[PDB]
Design a protein around this nucleic acid. Structure first.
Ligand code: NA
Length: 91
DNA sequence: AATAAGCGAAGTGGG
DNA sequence: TCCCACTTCCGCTTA
């Protein structure tokens, strides 16, 4: 199945949930979730994965934090904001 | 307090 | 066997 970082990058490229997620500086790979509309995007991730339970933004962000060490996605010190690596953006 | 974002041991999937 | 890539659960911290 698709990886979480790829699901997010694909959404940003397609624009299909523009009210839930958006680029901040696409050249730098920085993006931000909507405070009010991020849960709908989390729900979509869980359904795409076929997980047993309903996915929540909290659980999705718990997965996102695990990318910090390997580098695919890092948290930015701004509300709801993260940054893809150059390697992820290049692929 | 109420609300929200952010943080970081065991269970599940598919190798 | 034992890692992948999360998922789920739980408790805590900061604003
Ligand atoms: Na939140």
């Amino acid at each position: 199945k698709i990886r979480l970082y790829q699901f997010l990058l694909d959404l940003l490229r397609s624009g299909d949930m523009k009210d839930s997620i958006w680029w901040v500086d696409k050249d730098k790979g920085t993006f931000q979730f909507s405070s009010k509309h991020k849960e709908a995007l989390a729900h979509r991730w869980g359904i795409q994965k076929g997980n047993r339970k309903k996915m929540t933004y909290q659980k999705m962000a718990r997965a996102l934090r695990n990318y910090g060490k390997t580098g695919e996605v890092k948290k930015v010190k701004k509300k709801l904001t993260y940054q893809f690596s150059g390697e992820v953006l290049g692929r």
